[PDB]
Design an enzyme around this catalytic site. Structure first.
Site, PDB file in Angstrom:
ATOM      1  N   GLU A 151       0.777  -1.230   0.000  1.00  0.00           N
ATOM      2  CA  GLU A 151       0.000   0.000   0.000  1.00  0.00           C
ATOM      3  C   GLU A 151       0.808   1.278   0.000  1.00  0.00           C
ATOM      4  O   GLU A 151       0.746   2.161   0.862  1.00  0.00           O
ATOM      5  CB  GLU A 151      -0.940  -0.027   1.238  1.00  0.00           C
ATOM      6  CG  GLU A 151      -2.014   1.057   1.154  1.00  0.00           C
ATOM      7  CD  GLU A 151      -3.245   0.820   2.018  1.00  0.00           C
ATOM      8  OE1 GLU A 151      -3.192  -0.081   2.885  1.00  0.00           O
ATOM      9  OE2 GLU A 151      -4.245   1.557   1.831  1.00  0.00           O
ATOM     10  N   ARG A 203      -3.046   0.118  -3.787  1.00  0.00           N
ATOM     11  CA  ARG A 203      -3.869  -0.689  -2.869  1.00  0.00           C
ATOM     12  C   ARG A 203      -4.805   0.182  -2.067  1.00  0.00           C
ATOM     13  O   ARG A 203      -5.868  -0.293  -1.591  1.00  0.00           O
ATOM     14  CB  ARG A 203      -2.974  -1.577  -1.974  1.00  0.00           C
ATOM     15  CG  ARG A 203      -3.804  -2.752  -1.413  1.00  0.00           C
ATOM     16  CD  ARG A 203      -2.959  -3.665  -0.500  1.00  0.00           C
ATOM     17  NE  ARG A 203      -3.879  -4.633   0.120  1.00  0.00           N
ATOM     18  CZ  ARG A 203      -3.547  -5.860   0.527  1.00  0.00           C
ATOM     19  NH1 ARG A 203      -2.328  -6.379   0.516  1.00  0.00           N
ATOM     20  NH2 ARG A 203      -4.528  -6.610   0.996  1.00  0.00           N
ATOM     21  N   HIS A 231     -14.205   2.932   2.907  1.00  0.00           N
ATOM     22  CA  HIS A 231     -13.726   2.486   4.230  1.00  0.00           C
ATOM     23  C   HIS A 231     -13.221   3.603   5.101  1.00  0.00           C
ATOM     24  O   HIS A 231     -13.042   3.358   6.305  1.00  0.00           O
ATOM     25  CB  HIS A 231     -12.667   1.381   4.006  1.00  0.00           C
ATOM     26  CG  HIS A 231     -13.131   0.018   3.594  1.00  0.00           C
ATOM     27  ND1 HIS A 231     -13.792  -0.199   2.389  1.00  0.00           N
ATOM     28  CD2 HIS A 231     -12.973  -1.214   4.128  1.00  0.00           C
ATOM     29  CE1 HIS A 231     -14.050  -1.514   2.261  1.00  0.00           C
ATOM     30  NE2 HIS A 231     -13.580  -2.173   3.312  1.00  0.00           N
ATOM     31  N   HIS A 276     -15.020   2.710   8.170  1.00  0.00           N
ATOM     32  CA  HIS A 276     -14.364   2.221   9.383  1.00  0.00           C
ATOM     33  C   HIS A 276     -14.677   3.146  10.559  1.00  0.00           C
ATOM     34  O   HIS A 276     -14.699   2.732  11.717  1.00  0.00           O
ATOM     35  CB  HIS A 276     -12.855   2.011   9.154  1.00  0.00           C
ATOM     36  CG  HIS A 276     -12.477   0.670   8.595  1.00  0.00           C
ATOM     37  ND1 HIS A 276     -11.347   0.554   7.786  1.00  0.00           N
ATOM     38  CD2 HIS A 276     -12.994  -0.578   8.640  1.00  0.00           C
ATOM     39  CE1 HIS A 276     -11.183  -0.699   7.413  1.00  0.00           C
ATOM     40  NE2 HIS A 276     -12.191  -1.422   7.895  1.00  0.00           N
ATOM     41  N   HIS A 313     -19.363  -5.333   9.057  1.00  0.00           N
ATOM     42  CA  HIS A 313     -18.398  -4.561   8.249  1.00  0.00           C
ATOM     43  C   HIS A 313     -18.937  -4.074   6.913  1.00  0.00           C
ATOM     44  O   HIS A 313     -18.770  -2.904   6.520  1.00  0.00           O
ATOM     45  CB  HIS A 313     -17.184  -5.456   7.996  1.00  0.00           C
ATOM     46  CG  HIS A 313     -16.107  -4.789   7.170  1.00  0.00           C
ATOM     47  ND1 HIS A 313     -15.389  -3.719   7.642  1.00  0.00           N
ATOM     48  CD2 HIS A 313     -15.695  -5.068   5.908  1.00  0.00           C
ATOM     49  CE1 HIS A 313     -14.514  -3.365   6.666  1.00  0.00           C
ATOM     50  NE2 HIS A 313     -14.705  -4.143   5.619  1.00  0.00           N
TER      51      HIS A 313
HETATM   52  N1  LIG Z   1      -8.053  -8.717   5.621  1.00  0.00           N
HETATM   53  C1  LIG Z   1      -8.822  -8.179   4.654  1.00  0.00           C
HETATM   54  O1  LIG Z   1      -8.441  -7.893   3.517  1.00  0.00           O
HETATM   55  C2  LIG Z   1     -10.304  -7.945   5.052  1.00  0.00           C
HETATM   56  C3  LIG Z   1     -11.109  -7.555   3.953  1.00  0.00           C
HETATM   57  C4  LIG Z   1     -12.444  -7.328   4.306  1.00  0.00           C
HETATM   58  C5  LIG Z   1     -13.003  -7.427   5.543  1.00  0.00           C
HETATM   59  N2  LIG Z   1     -12.109  -7.818   6.565  1.00  0.00           N
HETATM   60  C6  LIG Z   1     -12.592  -8.065   7.924  1.00  0.00           C
HETATM   61  O2  LIG Z   1     -13.560  -9.138   7.743  1.00  0.00           O
HETATM   62  C7  LIG Z   1     -14.300  -9.246   8.970  1.00  0.00           C
HETATM   63  C8  LIG Z   1     -15.739  -9.664   8.577  1.00  0.00           C
HETATM   64  O3  LIG Z   1     -15.671 -11.029   8.098  1.00  0.00           O
HETATM   65  P1  LIG Z   1     -17.020 -11.932   7.944  1.00  0.00           P
HETATM   66  O4  LIG Z   1     -18.101 -11.004   7.489  1.00  0.00           O
HETATM   67  O5  LIG Z   1     -16.711 -13.048   7.082  1.00  0.00           O
HETATM   68  O6  LIG Z   1     -17.342 -12.288   9.475  1.00  0.00           O
HETATM   69  P2  LIG Z   1     -17.205 -13.720  10.263  1.00  0.00           P
HETATM   70  O7  LIG Z   1     -15.928 -14.447  10.048  1.00  0.00           O
HETATM   71  O8  LIG Z   1     -17.549 -13.440  11.686  1.00  0.00           O
HETATM   72  O9  LIG Z   1     -18.394 -14.565   9.614  1.00  0.00           O
HETATM   73  C9  LIG Z   1     -19.767 -14.064   9.636  1.00  0.00           C
HETATM   74  C10 LIG Z   1     -20.674 -14.973  10.433  1.00  0.00           C
HETATM   75  O10 LIG Z   1     -21.063 -16.165   9.710  1.00  0.00           O
HETATM   76  C11 LIG Z   1     -20.820 -17.413  10.458  1.00  0.00           C
HETATM   77  N3  LIG Z   1     -20.382 -18.267   9.362  1.00  0.00           N
HETATM   78  C12 LIG Z   1     -19.199 -18.184   8.661  1.00  0.00           C
HETATM   79  N4  LIG Z   1     -19.148 -19.020   7.625  1.00  0.00           N
HETATM   80  C13 LIG Z   1     -20.364 -19.676   7.690  1.00  0.00           C
HETATM   81  C14 LIG Z   1     -20.897 -20.702   6.876  1.00  0.00           C
HETATM   82  N5  LIG Z   1     -20.304 -21.210   5.813  1.00  0.00           N
HETATM   83  N6  LIG Z   1     -22.132 -21.177   7.229  1.00  0.00           N
HETATM   84  C15 LIG Z   1     -22.769 -20.651   8.317  1.00  0.00           C
HETATM   85  N7  LIG Z   1     -22.351 -19.697   9.122  1.00  0.00           N
HETATM   86  C16 LIG Z   1     -21.121 -19.251   8.745  1.00  0.00           C
HETATM   87  C17 LIG Z   1     -19.814 -16.934  11.476  1.00  0.00           C
HETATM   88  O11 LIG Z   1     -19.739 -17.824  12.560  1.00  0.00           O
HETATM   89  C18 LIG Z   1     -20.203 -15.493  11.792  1.00  0.00           C
HETATM   90  O12 LIG Z   1     -21.375 -15.512  12.633  1.00  0.00           O
HETATM   91  C19 LIG Z   1     -14.170  -7.859   9.643  1.00  0.00           C
HETATM   92  O13 LIG Z   1     -13.437  -8.057  10.865  1.00  0.00           O
HETATM   93  C20 LIG Z   1     -13.392  -7.003   8.630  1.00  0.00           C
HETATM   94  O14 LIG Z   1     -12.572  -6.025   9.260  1.00  0.00           O
HETATM   95  C21 LIG Z   1     -10.793  -8.066   6.346  1.00  0.00           C
HETATM   96  O1  LIG Z   2      -6.351  -3.635   1.055  1.00  0.00           O
HETATM   97  C1  LIG Z   2      -7.296  -4.466   1.281  1.00  0.00           C
HETATM   98  O2  LIG Z   2      -7.211  -5.686   1.117  1.00  0.00           O
HETATM   99  C2  LIG Z   2      -8.531  -3.848   1.983  1.00  0.00           C
HETATM  100  O3  LIG Z   2      -8.521  -2.445   1.625  1.00  0.00           O
HETATM  101  C3  LIG Z   2      -8.203  -3.970   3.493  1.00  0.00           C
HETATM  102  C4  LIG Z   2      -9.382  -3.457   4.354  1.00  0.00           C
HETATM  103  C5  LIG Z   2      -8.922  -3.498   5.837  1.00  0.00           C
HETATM  104  P1  LIG Z   2      -7.758  -2.164   6.307  1.00  0.00           P
HETATM  105  O4  LIG Z   2      -8.435  -0.815   5.971  1.00  0.00           O
HETATM  106  O5  LIG Z   2      -7.618  -2.280   7.818  1.00  0.00           O
HETATM  107  O6  LIG Z   2      -6.443  -2.360   5.593  1.00  0.00           O
HETATM  108  C6  LIG Z   2     -10.612  -4.275   4.023  1.00  0.00           C
HETATM  109  O7  LIG Z   2     -11.697  -3.975   4.904  1.00  0.00           O
HETATM  110  C7  LIG Z   2     -10.998  -4.025   2.564  1.00  0.00           C
HETATM  111  O8  LIG Z   2     -12.253  -4.611   2.177  1.00  0.00           O
HETATM  112  C8  LIG Z   2      -9.884  -4.434   1.607  1.00  0.00           C
HETATM  113 ZN   LIG Z   3     -13.707  -4.045   3.758  1.00  0.00          ZN
END
Ligand SMILES: NC(=O)c1ccc[n+]([C@@H]2O[C@H](COP(=O)([O-])OP(=O)(O)OC[C@H]3O[C@@H](n4cnc5c(N)ncnc54)[C@H](O)[C@@H]3O)[C@@H](O)[C@H]2O)c1
Ligand SMILES: O=C(O)[C@]1(O)C[C@H](CP(=O)(O)O)[C@@H](O)[C@H](O)C1
Ligand SMILES: [Zn+2]
Ligand SMILES: NC(=O)c1ccc[n+]([C@@H]2O[C@H](COP(=O)([O-])OP(=O)(O)OC[C@H]3O[C@@H](n4cnc5c(N)ncnc54)[C@H](O)[C@@H]3O)[C@@H](O)[C@H]2O)c1
Ligand SMILES: O=C(O)[C@]1(O)C[C@H](CP(=O)(O)O)[C@@H](O)[C@H](O)C1
Ligand SMILES: [Cl-]
Ligand SMILES: [Zn+2]
Lengths: 381, 380
Positions: free
Chosen positions: A250, A254, A261, A265, A277
């Protein structure tokens, strides 16, 4: 199985049934270890680990000495993205007999909460160990399992402590969607929509045209919507992989994956854990599109398409959405609070707040987030 | 001009007496440009050394627009600070600034290895990683810990179990800091110097044997002789790191003495220091190589004597160790349990660095040693 390269590695593998047929053997052959640690949450562990435990024994039947598979079931939801849960997992791995060591292969079986928390565990465990992503949510398949960003939250805000640590494998298995609750499918669509808005008018148009069909399949799975579902998911993963390969850490491009966000955020720090989210990002997309309009960079016509497309998939477009208000217990998201939270946005260049601005649907204003004055931001808050 | 040493393809190491007074501030402003500099140190050191730097910093940043800020954090001294809580406390303090420290932040680790390891680890995960520089103020940090990017904290179960590889942008080595270093700490650092020579240069090991009396006399009251032993240790580590940054084999050698040493240190910290525990670990791992028929008894004696000539302990029975740990003892079972947590182990196979002679390792990586063989050298 379909393959997608990222950062010069053929690590993304996609096919219905990978978890049942392919993952165990592929781990034993390409991620050879004495010790595999599977991290998941209590909603999904009892549904999905039994089969894998069996697949693992079979795959490990002719390896000597026998490898072990160890399982950690964390509480579900954002509250688990914390210092405490990261420490708890670490303490348990270190407490194994014998302890988990540097050969450990960690398996993140879950959505982005489990993937972000587990990938961060793997990044600092003894200074780093291999891990793989097994995304079980739509959000994780189209966005969070790809690209290596890992983190936990603090009481001040989202993802402020973490690390970029790439998984050795990313297994995308659409069969997991069959048990995914309706609200979570809708939550994931915000990231699909965002990814199209920053890269392609045609892909954005396909999403608009598909809304009614997909939503009906979701609320009624997916046998009749299988090809469209696959194409919209692959379009999101492939664009993300492109951007990451060009700018892993980034320095510019990126930033674009963070459209929606900066304000999203800032809202999420307040509304979690009641609001998700993707739900927070949808309101953040609307406000940031309204900001670009305010600055004259984005056309009103474009802001209306963004609003409508999110609404067509059932996502909120306002902090006062009635479904949001029923869940938040009167929480406040005032302008001053949101500005304070935006000062913690990781894209900021010193005190200059940086937000992604779109100039049209499918086209970013710049190949990075832009600097925007505090007064202009205050208008859309 | 100051001496420069290349590491991982860049001339990140810069050494000269007086750098902290005359060079760092300007060099950070030009080469690590930022709006926000965060200096992390410990209370023993800060009041002595930060006041001069605050002034140098303001001076160096005079033509910069807008003016950058310098923020300082003074942690408690010693191993107790390499902890989850102290990492979180620094992170919370950075995020609480007005405005918050962001991704442009340049973190300055002003201290020995406790401050270096802790600060480096904070830098590596802050907003997923920010730049940092090392300003080593102990002998141990100048010859070993400030170089190479290993950062970490401890947990109640053992040494450096959680951490990250994150390289500093600059490593400034200023011998002037040694003017105030306590004698016990200087001796503590000499364990890493002796180790470095024993794993790779019989010439350097000889130079250390020959200079012990003179160096200790000066410590307790040669600059070129000292500078040369410091520079030999640093260059040897920079070659090893440049060649095997993430420890796929060769970097294991820098852990000679440390398989047994870190097992002892898990029990005896914070009363006994790292170098002190590694000194005993070098003797026992040498005995182990002797037991396996790999190292000759004469070489073991030569290692013991060199360690003792510098005033380091060579046994768990050392009277000074017994005085500071009254009520603490190291059992064979506890040592063995702790060695199972060693980060070099291949699954349950314990891996220990074996020497075939002073200056030559058995192989250029750690070797698997059966548990029943390790146990034989663990008694006091
Ligand atoms: N690292 C990245 O690039 C990135 C990108 C986007 C979002 N995020 C993060 O992602 C998180 C949100 O992830 P999420 O929405 O997947 O949440 P999560 O992992 O909590 O899953 C959502 C819910 O669905 C249930 N679940 C999951 N898979 C299931 C399945 N196959 N069948 C039934 N139930 C199921 C879980 O137990 C939970 O209740 C946030 O913390 C956000 O900051 C990170
Ligand atoms: O660079 C990425 O992969 C993201 O921008 C990373 C963010 C998390 P960040 O803002 O904490 O990097 C994520 O929520 C988004 O959907 C995709
Ligand atoms: Zn996101
Ligand atoms: N990362 C690595 O490669 C690496 C290598 C070797 C050792 N280590 C780690 O280094 C740590 C030990 O570091 P250390 O021995 O430098 O300890 P330290 O940083 O605690 O410093 C030793 C003592 O001297 C004081 N002090 C430091 N500089 C001084 C000065 N110039 N004048 C006066 N007092 C001064 C400190 O306050 C402290 O009391 C251990 O935690 C060990 O695990 C890490
Ligand atoms: O590779 C290194 O830099 C070291 O082996 C790293 C160790 C710490 P580690 O065993 O936690 O990696 C350090 O104490 C030793 O003096 C040098
Ligand atoms: Cl951490
Ligand atoms: Zn050491």
């Amino acid at each position: 199985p379909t393959k997608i390269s990222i950062l010069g590695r053929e690590s993304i593998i996609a096919d219905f049934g990978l978890w049942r047929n392919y993952v165990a053997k592929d781990l034993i052959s390409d991620c050879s270890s004495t010790t595999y640690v599977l991290v998941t949450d209590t909603n999904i562990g009892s549904i999905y680990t039994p089969s894998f435990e069996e697949a693992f024994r079979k795959r490990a039947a002719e390896i000597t000495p026998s490898p072990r598979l160890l399982i950690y079931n964390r509480p579900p939801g954002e509250v688990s993205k914390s210092r405490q849960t990261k420490a708890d997992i670490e303490d348990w791995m270190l407490s194994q007999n014998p302890p988990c060591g540097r050969d450990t292969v960690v398996i993140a079986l879950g959505g982005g909460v489990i993937g972000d928390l587990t990938g961060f565990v793997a990044s600092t465990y003894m200074r780093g160990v291999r891990y793989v992503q097994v995304p079980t949510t739509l959000l994780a398949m189209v966005d969070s399992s790809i690209g290596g960003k890992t983190a936990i939250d603090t009481p001040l805000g989202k993802n402020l402590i973490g690390a970029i640590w790439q998984p050795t494998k990313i297994y995308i298995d659409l069969e997991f969607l069959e048990t995914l609750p309706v609200r979570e499918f809708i939550n994931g669509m915000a990231e699909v929509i965002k990814t199209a808005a920053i890269s392609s008018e045609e892909e954005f148009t396909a999403l608009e045209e598909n809304a009614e069909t997909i939503l009906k399949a979701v609320r009624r799975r997916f046998e009749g919507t299988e090809e469209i579902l696959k194409a919209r998911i692959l379009a999101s993963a492939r664009h993300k992989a492109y951007v990451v390969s060009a700018d892993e850490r980034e320095g510019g491009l990126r930033n674009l994956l963070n459209w929606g966000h900066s304000i999203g955020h800032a809202i999420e720090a307040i509304l979690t854990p009641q609001i998700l989210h993707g739900e927070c990002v949808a309101i953040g997309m609307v406000k940031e599109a309204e900001l670009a309009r305010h600055l004259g960079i984005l056309k009103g016509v474009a802001v209306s398409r963004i609003v409508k497309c999110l609404a067509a998939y059932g996502l909120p477009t306002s902090l006062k959405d009635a479904r949001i208000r029923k869940l938040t217990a009167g929480k406040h998201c005032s302008v001053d609070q949101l500005m304070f939270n935006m000062a913690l946005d990781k894209k900021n260049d010193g005190p200059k707040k940086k937000i992604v601005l779109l100039s049209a649907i499918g086209t970013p204003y710049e190949t990075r987030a832009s600097v925007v004055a505090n007064e202009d931001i205050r208008v859309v808050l």
